[PDB]
Amino acid sequence: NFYQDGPQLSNTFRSDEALQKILKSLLPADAQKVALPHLEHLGERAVTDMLTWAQEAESQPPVHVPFDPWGRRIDDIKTSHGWKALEKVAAEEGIVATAYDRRFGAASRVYQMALLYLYSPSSAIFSCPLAMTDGAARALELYADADLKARVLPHLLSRDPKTFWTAGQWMTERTGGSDVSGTSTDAHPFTGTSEFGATHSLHGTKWFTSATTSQMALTLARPDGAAPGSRGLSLFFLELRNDKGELNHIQIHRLKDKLGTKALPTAELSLQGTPARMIGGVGEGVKRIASVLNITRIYNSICAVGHIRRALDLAQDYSGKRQAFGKLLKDHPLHKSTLDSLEADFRKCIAFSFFVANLLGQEEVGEASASEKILLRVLTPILKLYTAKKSIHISSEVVEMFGGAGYVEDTGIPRLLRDAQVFSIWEGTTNVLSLDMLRAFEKDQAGQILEQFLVLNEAGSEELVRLQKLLTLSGEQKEQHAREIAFLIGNAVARIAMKKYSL
Amino acid sequence: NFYQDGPQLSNTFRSDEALQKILKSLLPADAQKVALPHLEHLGERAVTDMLTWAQEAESQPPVHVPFDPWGRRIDDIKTSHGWKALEKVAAEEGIVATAYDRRFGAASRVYQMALLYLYSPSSAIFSCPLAMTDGAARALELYADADLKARVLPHLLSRDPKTFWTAGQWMTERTGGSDVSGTSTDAHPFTGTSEFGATHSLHGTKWFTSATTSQMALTLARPDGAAPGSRGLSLFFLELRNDKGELNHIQIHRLKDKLGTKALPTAELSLQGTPARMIGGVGEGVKRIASVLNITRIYNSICAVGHIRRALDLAQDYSGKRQAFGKLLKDHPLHKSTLDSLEADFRKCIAFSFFVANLLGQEEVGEASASEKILLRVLTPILKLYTAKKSIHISSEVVEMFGGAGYVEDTGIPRLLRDAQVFSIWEGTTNVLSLDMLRAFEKDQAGQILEQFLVLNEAGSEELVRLQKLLTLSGEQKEQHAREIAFLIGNAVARIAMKKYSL
Amino acid sequence: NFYQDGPQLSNTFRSDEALQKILKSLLPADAQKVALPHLEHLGERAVTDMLTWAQEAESQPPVHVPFDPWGRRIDDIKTSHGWKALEKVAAEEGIVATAYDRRFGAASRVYQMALLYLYSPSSAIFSCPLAMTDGAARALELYADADLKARVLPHLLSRDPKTFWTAGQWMTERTGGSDVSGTSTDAHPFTGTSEFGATHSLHGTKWFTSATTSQMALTLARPDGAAPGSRGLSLFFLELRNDKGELNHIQIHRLKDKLGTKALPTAELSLQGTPARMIGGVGEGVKRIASVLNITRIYNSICAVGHIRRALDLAQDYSGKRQAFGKLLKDHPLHKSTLDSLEADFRKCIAFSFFVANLLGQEEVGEASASEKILLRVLTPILKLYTAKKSIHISSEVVEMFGGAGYVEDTGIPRLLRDAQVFSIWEGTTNVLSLDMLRAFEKDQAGQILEQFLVLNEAGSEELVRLQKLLTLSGEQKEQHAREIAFLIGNAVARIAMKKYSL
Amino acid sequence: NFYQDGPQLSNTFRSDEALQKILKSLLPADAQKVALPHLEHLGERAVTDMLTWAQEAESQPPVHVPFDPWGRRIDDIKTSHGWKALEKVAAEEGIVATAYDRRFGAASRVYQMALLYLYSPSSAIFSCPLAMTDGAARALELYADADLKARVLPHLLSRDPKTFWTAGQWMTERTGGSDVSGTSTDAHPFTGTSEFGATHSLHGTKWFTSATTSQMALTLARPDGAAPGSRGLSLFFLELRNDKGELNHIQIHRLKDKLGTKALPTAELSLQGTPARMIGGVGEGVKRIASVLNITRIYNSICAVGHIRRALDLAQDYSGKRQAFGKLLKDHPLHKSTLDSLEADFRKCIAFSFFVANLLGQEEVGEASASEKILLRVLTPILKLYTAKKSIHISSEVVEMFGGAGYVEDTGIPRLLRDAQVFSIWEGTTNVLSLDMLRAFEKDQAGQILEQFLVLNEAGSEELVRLQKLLTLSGEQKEQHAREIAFLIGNAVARIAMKKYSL
């Protein structure tokens, strides 16, 4: 009898006209002759060996083994081979390292984000460890002494799987993740020896972490006698293991059982005298880790848009295979209209994301003006919250486009919704990032810089005037309308970027 | 140190001012003196023994046991005690039966839907079998002879758990659920024995079913020699087991592993000569199930709005317990604005749902005018698609309101999203129901009756002309705008109902 | 086609002629008119509601939940309803309490062991907590002050499920279970308050425990400044929880994943300042807990023989249902011979066990002579190691009697082997108990008392002379032959007991 | 504090003096210079990469996937990478193929069985598919025409993992495995297409199989019109899949959930018109498989003895690491005596196994005398039942030697018992093989040849007359004593072999 043909993917570089148009606009000729063959290669991996490895990892979530059979506390995390293979891919394909090889100026970061864009949707969210890894590298690059950099950066930026390290960012505690002022981890002076010049020992509990699959982490802690709240916090570097391969006074409580990102180990950890090294000076921890957030927020946006592209690729292919009421779905005007609406949102998201990625590249190579640095600071929280909300909306619509099959896990479709929902939570909720945006307006004339940019780049008169109205509201009402303001700006910049890239 | 206090529920009758206002409007005094004490009692169960049973059922999904240890095909489905307990609650509390005791005229159905509204969110979606059970009761009431009614209705409408039956509705096949014209199940004339006057034996595969724990089912099949497509389909009644308790030539292929509704068994079944009894004549099947669909689509809506209420109850309670940046969440203007927006959608949904529930009650007791019957027919698909989309949107926002905790399954919060996503899929997707709406407009000039209703009851000026603008469009452009039309109408009717009930 | 009829059980009092003959010999008329109706009742439960509950418990092993969803350490152990129900049965049926109601003199213990014999094989090894409970009661009865006894004994000996307590015996540490001299748990003086007059706080790790399902435990610990090795150990009483239902500075590391006894929670625990009360004086812990071992060893023997009876009941029933080569298995001479051999071993085991149970009863009611107390001390380790080895041999033969089906878990047959294998491990291995036997010979002229008993009761001349030879060997050779000696004596006493009971 | 050192293995060629002595006796110089380096290499793999792969396979049992996500029946079996790796090892190391390279005459089979002896205990029972693969190769060698041999033997005997095939032997049905006369699978004449010259289509159910990962199988079926019982059964060859990789009308009902051999897929299968090719004539099936059974029963024996060796290697190592009562276990006379007893049984088993392996080699290269061929036929069932019972006894004692740890699965010790218990069940129970032995005695006066062999080679005086006493008993009393006869003979031959090999 009848069996429905399921959705199939095709090379995700060649299938993505929007990505190609953007790169033709943002990459100079010399970058293109390196980057484009690499991207076509990665696009093939994304739908072949990576796709298989990601499915394996999703199907075999990590398992915590606290004790060996004779009672020794080992806190092992067992992972799938697929998960380990995707880590090796991240190293050898230079998914992080490409940004730090600045041959192509601002285009180095654009090239790297393009690699991430293809890699992430077939990575079972290994792209999240990559974001934290990239962030840690930059933080060390900016603030760490020469000896610490010489030790760690060759690992984080390695193209060699056998020497590649990932980093964790352990910022969230039970008191809060949005607000870290309640951080209860203490840092006592330490005078023992260590391989990285530890200065303190850490004591506390970290409530969401990427567990023990990372070799290093950055974290916040409060030194003996330091002030209460955020001002008392310093940034610390630590390595998870010693020479032995033994955990450095770190205990794993358990893995979280999550809605999605199931292949990613997310653990609750206790630091029990973990040796650590302060990065920067006392009380500057929050500000120091602040200057990395443009990276992690932009990784999140690019991953969210890659996720959107994956969901739509599956939906588009199915729409040309499933018939109802005598027609293929793609030929039903209402279905086609729905598809078109989602694709239009996709084009906004990818243009907005790469516009901002290019600004990040400019800043990293020292080409950004003072005002441009402020503009980047304003746009990244907006980009993040905008692409994340769109990714959830689009994923939910795609689940429904598959009908009953979309609700059944072995089709691979429910994962689209479960994983998308993370994008609007980690690294800031919609509302927290909307307030970060509003806050930014208050300082360094950020509001005016944003307005000059929108006027110069010919944002719509209607949206310009509506923005001016919203920004004249009371403090209280601007907070109440902070989402509206963020999405107004996001849509305006997305349209500007689309025109710029001829999308 | 610090541990966050998690969300807590309270009696869901006493906590719901909107439900109480609606019932003060819709229930006459005599109905109130029976119904309100019953609802307060049920509201207490919803947050005590039912809540525990539902958690147990979610935690222990059903398991298929195809073979006994000696190779006999038994196709057992093992379920939790909690699941069985929630079934007993449905019977003893009259979650279905209350509607069929038409003591209170049209208010009997309103009283029943209020019971469902409190029951469903603490039922681990046992309310879905109840919808199909109610639908089957009505179909038999309208179309079955006295002997079949006397046999079956005392079971479906039982208040005695020991004699209560549920029904399945087996309409979807691999070829389609939206479009059932492709139904490939054959019905051969049958003269063997059965307890219910079987006329045919059925041969085919049913692709989504509530499996084999229901005692009876309604289904569609094509009798020998019948026309192709929908015109060849007849409605059939069948009982799943014989007196020995053996399945009547039904095999379970497997249970679906689903995104959500995990406590609910959803099975793929093969009918292998299952005896069945034709209800009505050849080619009348699709038309006969039309009045089963009105009931299930209103059940779906009431269940979706009860789900919204549960999500918001959890969010509201947490918002008074969780601190960030120096304030409880409920005291942050943006957080409060977000909550207010969700509550506003809730009030639209609950008013719209009970407005339609009242129309259903009017029709069932023979008190509905021609226009009211037409209004009921056009509004039911709109109500279903409207409440389903709102429930998904609100659930996703509530998951995000809990931050990282919202993404971790043991908090009970991710279930809100996973379960909500089913509401826009079963019983019709948004687009399929929007087209059903448009088709309904075209017949008996139903479209005109709706518009006079909207004009008479003083719908909003702008949205009305925008709505009127859309209904004058060409056929295909009208299809492209079918969603917008549905949501405009839904919002207009919700506003009318809220005013009517003083919400 | 063909389906094999599987094995079925029948009332295990009425089906057991050997048990009935023994009780007709050991129970006086007044005891019989109470005990026999009770046993017939329990025999019916063993094959009805208990059997179902035990299967549920085996099918749903206990699960450790260390943390609540908000990070509080709760160390819950989730168990099946069946497991909880079997606990209630133990209380209401007086499976422990009957022995301590000494109306019937020495026959009270015999009556109780008969209850255990029927209960244990349908208890999913809840009989193990009962053994430790009985033991704890006796220890408190002998050595605890009046106030501690008045508090605890009404719980341990309760017939009321709502007030019934079980006890754990936490003797094994990582250094050893056979040899407890390496015990590393410290007992520091304690001056805080507690509900049971705690005198110390305990600090250490207990490597095999019955987890948190018990309300109290007995354990060994070394007080501040005490001698090394066994002589430095004292016996302690502790309660697992306080008023709150909170664990008293007890942390659960994990549950063991075991070969069998899967329904029984077996945990690794850390005592982290657990309040405890010393029982008896400093350094007498090993000797004090020594005087209970006759109880736990006899429980183990009775449970092992009940296990044998269950395996043989299943095998006998199957042998009358399965045909091969034209005959039922029971009519194949070699199969029948194999069955007869196993049954002969059963009759030895049950006679030996109840002979020893009767000696225990005599001692507990003060009717035992000095020599009889010594005889009991010699016979209990022999009984334990003998019945345990036989239970494993018989279970393995029964698995094989079922052919391929015996190797498949859903038949319930592999459990027979997996569970039996525990009998020869807990409470002493074959070799450790054989050496305990040899040790006993050395003191209080135990060897001669044993010989006088065997001669008086007309043991076989051949076995008598062989025993005399073995006992004249060197110290080294007697140890090498300790198993042979134990089984020679066990078989001799079993034959004596069988003749005495007309088996 | 203290953590117990667990057991460790070492190269299992170098650690095995008995194996080396046997091979110095059985392998001529030219065979030794090839075989000994190969065996030392394999002995290293057994405790390194194979050990890890076997642990992985045990930890991740196979999973049946009956349907793809769109409802297609695929009956996939998902296996671990470790399982697949152990299959590749079997090919590349020539664990089967070495026997068929008869370079070394009868010593080729001895060399091969030595490879199997080292491979099997670290193979997670992949050695069972190898036994059936070897059996199938021999059957085709004897009975298949040139074209079928040319097609299939290069696969079964391949050293290239990419072309290696395994075979199933599907003999057992629900009616019986010991007695196959009840076989109900029909064979209808067939003229459709196939790659191997199929003659019939098979219809029936196979109750224990190694499932669908093997490429071919041998099986019994009753052609249309054939006689009832064994006289109607013919031997059939079939290939499981077509060129597309689709199963050839074979459905998997389920995988068995077993006591042990958990890595091995054991499935219940239905043949639904499976094309097959008759090998030989009608009614010759049972006779034709007789020479497949000799090979598999010797494989079983060698695997059982390799299992014994693994258990004892673990026990021996632990005995030098675990202290109790002031001494390492190995220095306690009773513990040492117990170990010595087990090792003595091991030496009997390994000598007996290779003695028979040599006879098999002699017969396969045409060098065996009439008496040797008869000796091989009578000894093979005895060897199988003898080694199987010893392996279970020794495994149980080894589990107990580890104390509580022996009962906990993560130590790897309980597997020893669970897996050993299969050896006395598959390929014939103790009693069925004992009767096979007796039947063999009765034909061609084989019984007499054995006894002269025993007398000639100077069997023990007492046991011989006791054995001679038993063989003169009446038919039925001889049946009742069939086990005793088998074990007397086994012990006598083991003593003869040990002397012959200087063990």
Automatic annotation (TrEMBL), chains A, B, C, D:
Which controlled-vocabulary keywords does the entry list? FAD, Flavoprotein, Nucleotide-binding, Oxidoreductase
Give the EC class as a word. Answer: oxidoreductase
Binding residue positions for FAD: 169, 171-172, 177-178, 322, 400, 404, 429
What transmembrane ranges does the database entry give? none
Q: Which family does it belong to?
A: Belongs to the acyl-CoA dehydrogenase family.
Can you name the source organism? Bdellovibrio bacteriovorus (strain ATCC 15356 / DSM 50701 / NCIMB 9529 / HD100)
Q: What is this protein called?
A: Probable acyl-CoA dehydrogenase
Q: Where is the Adaptive response protein AidB N-terminal domain?
A: 10-159
GO function terms (MF aspect): acyl-CoA dehydrogenase activity; nucleotide binding
